[PDB]
Structure 1
Amino acid sequence: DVRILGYDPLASPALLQVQIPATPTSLETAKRGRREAIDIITGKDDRVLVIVGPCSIHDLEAAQEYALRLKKLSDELKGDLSIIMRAYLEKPRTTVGWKGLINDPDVNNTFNINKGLQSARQLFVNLTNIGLPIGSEMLDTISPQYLADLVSFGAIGARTTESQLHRELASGLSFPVGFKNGTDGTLNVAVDACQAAAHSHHFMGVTKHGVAAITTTKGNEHCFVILRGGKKGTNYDAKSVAEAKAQLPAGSNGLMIDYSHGNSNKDFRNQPKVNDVVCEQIANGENAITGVMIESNINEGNQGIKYGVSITDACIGWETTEDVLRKLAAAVRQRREVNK
C-alpha cells in the first residue's frame, strides 16, 4: 500500500438515512418522478421528460431558491412536461478539478466527504420535500447507497457510458437511467450500455451497512440514450435523430436530447437554439424524442474560483429557462395535434 496515504472513517449509508430521514413527501415525490419518467420514455405518456437545472450544486440555499421557481413552473406546465431538477453532486473532470458537493463540499481542497454526504442528503431531502423530483449523475458506484431512495433519474456521463462498472451499477438502480453518447459523438456505446444494463449482473458492491458483498441485480429496462454531441459534431437535428433511430434495437426506449455540452458547441447561449430545432421536430410529429436535458441556473453564465451562477459549465438563466420550457410545452401540444 505504498500509494495509500490513509483511510478515514465513513458513516454507513444506513446511518445517514437515519440521521437525515426522508419525509413522506420526499419519498412520494421520488416515486412519482420515477413513474412519470418511466411512462414517458416507454411511450405510455405523450408529455416530454425534462431534466433541467444547474450543471452542479455548490450552494444549497441557491439550489433551494431555484427549486422553488422550477416547482412553480412545473405546476404551470405539467399537462405537457414532466420536470425533474438536475441536482448533480458528482462531476467528472477532464483531468483534475472540483469533483462536486460530496467530494469537497467546502470547495477548498479539504475533501470532507462525510460532510459532503450529509449536505448531499439534506439537499436531496429539502428539494424533494417541496414536491420536486431530482436527478443526478451516478459517477461514484458507492454514493447511490446513501441517496437512491430520494432520486427519480440517474445519468451515466459520456466518459463512463463505456464502463462495465457503470452498466453493472445502472442494472441495479430503482429508477430510469440515461446513458450519454460517447465523447466522440457516436451513439453505439450508449446503445451497448442500455442493452448491458438491461441484463442481470453479479459483482462486488457496498451494502447499506458499508461492507463489501456480492450484489445480484435484476437488470434495468428503463435505460435510454441521451444525445449530447461530441467530436463528430452536434446530434440534436433531424438527420442526427433519424440516424439515431436507425440504430436502435427492438425494445428501445425514447431518445433524450441534451441541449448543452457538445450540443451547445462550447456556448451556453446555444441551448435556446437547440430548443428551437428540437421543438420543430416534436411539433411536426417526431415521437422518438421523449426527453430533453438543459443546463439552467438562477443566473446565466459561469465563473471560475457571485450568487446563483455556475462554478462548472455555463447555464442559461432563469428567465431564459421559462421561455425555453414554455416553448417546449407548446411543441408538445402541437405534436398531440399531429398524432390525432
Structure 2
Amino acid sequence: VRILGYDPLASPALLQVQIPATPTSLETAKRGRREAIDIITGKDDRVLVIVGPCSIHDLEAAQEYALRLKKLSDELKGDLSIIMRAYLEKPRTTVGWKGLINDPDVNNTFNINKGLQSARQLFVNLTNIGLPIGSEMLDTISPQYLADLVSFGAIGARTTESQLHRELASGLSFPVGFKNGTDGTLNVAVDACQAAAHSHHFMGVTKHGVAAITTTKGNEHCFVILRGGKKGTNYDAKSVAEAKAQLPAGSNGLMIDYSHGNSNKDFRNQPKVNDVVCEQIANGENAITGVMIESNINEGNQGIPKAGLKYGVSITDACIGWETTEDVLRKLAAAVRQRREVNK
C-alpha cells in the first residue's frame, strides 16, 4: 500500500559496458588505493588527504576543480597523497537533496538511471586525468555500478553503527573510513572497524542486477575518522590521545575531518582545525595519517531554487574556497616535512 511503483533500472554490468573505464582511470584508481593503504598502515610517512566538495552536482565544475587539485597534487606529492571528494550520496538529517545519483536534475524528478550514468561518467572523467576519487558509501547497491573507479570509501556518522554498512565495507576493494557518531564519540567507529574486518554473509545485488547471497573476506583497511559532534570537536591532542587509547592492536592510522562536527557550524573553522592538526603532525604525531576537507571552487553554500545555481558553490554543506584550500594544503605539506625531521 505504500509502494507507488517500481521503475526499471539498468544493471551494473550494463552501465559498465555503456560507460567503460579508460586504462588511465583504472590505473589511477589502483594507485590511489595503494597509496592510501601505505599511509594508513604506516608504510609511508605522507598524509592521506580526502579533499573536495561536500557534494557533486555539476560535472563541468567538478572537472575544473579536479584539474586544479591534480596540479596542486603533482606539486605536493612528496608530502601528501590526495584523493578528491566526489560524493554522490548525501545523508540528510531529515529530508533534502540526496545527491547526483538520486536526483541529478536537482528538481525532484528522481531520474536515478540518469544519475547513475552521470555518476559513472563523472568518476571516469576525474580518474582519467590521474586524480583518484572517494565517496561516501551510503547506498548498498550503487557501489556495484562504480567501485572499479573508487580509491576510498567513507561510511558516514549516521551509518557507522549500521550493520548493513559494516557488511558493505567488509566487501569493498579499497580503504574505508568510519566516521565517529553524531554524538561526537568514537566507540562506534572503533566497533565498526572491528566488524568490517570480519567476513560477512548477506543478501546483496550482483553486477547482473539480481539479489544473491554475498560472502565477503573482511576489510583490514578500515580506519576511524574524527569529525566531532554534539560532545564537541575532537581534532585536538587530548582527543587524539583518547582515540589512540581505544584502538586495538592491528589498528590503522586515524583521519581527522576538518569539517562537519569539527567546524562547529562554520566553513571558516576548517583552516583553524588545520592549524591544530599541523601542530600535532609537525611535533611528531605519527598516528594522524589522514585528513578530510570540504573544499570547492568558491566558498560557502547556496539554496536550491539548477539553472539558477551559482557556479562552483555547494548546494549542501558550506565549503572553503579554492584559494583557502591551497593555503591549507601547503601548510599541511610543511607539517609533514617537519614530522620527518622529528622522526629522524
Name structure 1 gaps, 5 residues minimum.
Answer: none
TM-score, length of structure 2 as denominator length: 0.98
Counterpart Cα distance in 2 of 1:330 and 1:184: 33
Q: CA deviation at 1:128?
A: 0.1
Q: What SS is found at the alignment partner of 1:195?
A: helix
- Pair 1:203-2:202 in alignment: yes
Output one character per residue of 1:107-142: Cα deviation in whole Å (capped at 9) or x when no partner. Answer: 000000000000000000000000000000000000
Output one character per residue of 1:259-293: Cα deviation in whole Å (capped at 9) or x when no partner. Answer: 00000000000000000000000000000000000
Output one character per residue of 1:71-130: Cα deviation in whole Å (capped at 9) or x when no partner. Answer: 000000000000000000000000000000000000000000000000000000000000
Counterpart Cα distance in 2 of 1:239 and 1:187: 13
What RMSD in Å do the two structures reach over aligned CA positions? Answer: 0.3
Q: CA deviation at 1:54?
A: 0.1
Output one character per residue of 1:33-87: Cα deviation in whole Å (capped at 9) or x when no partner. Answer: 0000000000000000000000000000000000000000000000000000000
Name structure 2 gaps, 5 residues minimum.
Answer: 305-309
Aligned residue in 1 for 2:136: 137
TM-score, length of structure 1 as denominator length: 1.00
Aligned residue in 1 for 2:238: 239
- Pair 1:44-2:43 in alignment: yes
Q: What SS is found at the alignment partner of 2:270?
A: helix
Q: CA deviation at 1:226?
A: 0.1
Q: What SS is found at the alignment partner of 1:261?
A: strand
Q: CA deviation at 1:28?
A: 0.2
Q: CA deviation at 1:176?
A: 0.1
Aligned residue in 2 for 1:271: 270
Q: CA deviation at 1:155?
A: 0.2
Counterpart Cα distance in 2 of 1:35 and 1:56: 25
Counterpart Cα distance in 2 of 1:265 and 1:6: 41
Counterpart Cα distance in 1 of 2:334 and 2:77: 12
Aligned residue in 1 for 2:253: 254
Q: List aligned pairs for 1:210-229, cutoff 5 A.
A: 210-229=209-228
Counterpart Cα distance in 2 of 1:42 and 1:73: 24
Counterpart Cα distance in 2 of 1:108 and 1:3: 23
Counterpart Cα distance in 1 of 2:156 and 2:215: 23
Counterpart Cα distance in 2 of 1:275 and 1:60: 28
Give the share of equivalent positions with the same residue, in percent. Answer: 100
Q: CA deviation at 1:146?
A: 0.1
Query: Where has structure 1 moved over 2 Å in runs of 4 or more?
Result: none
Aligned residue in 1 for 2:307: none
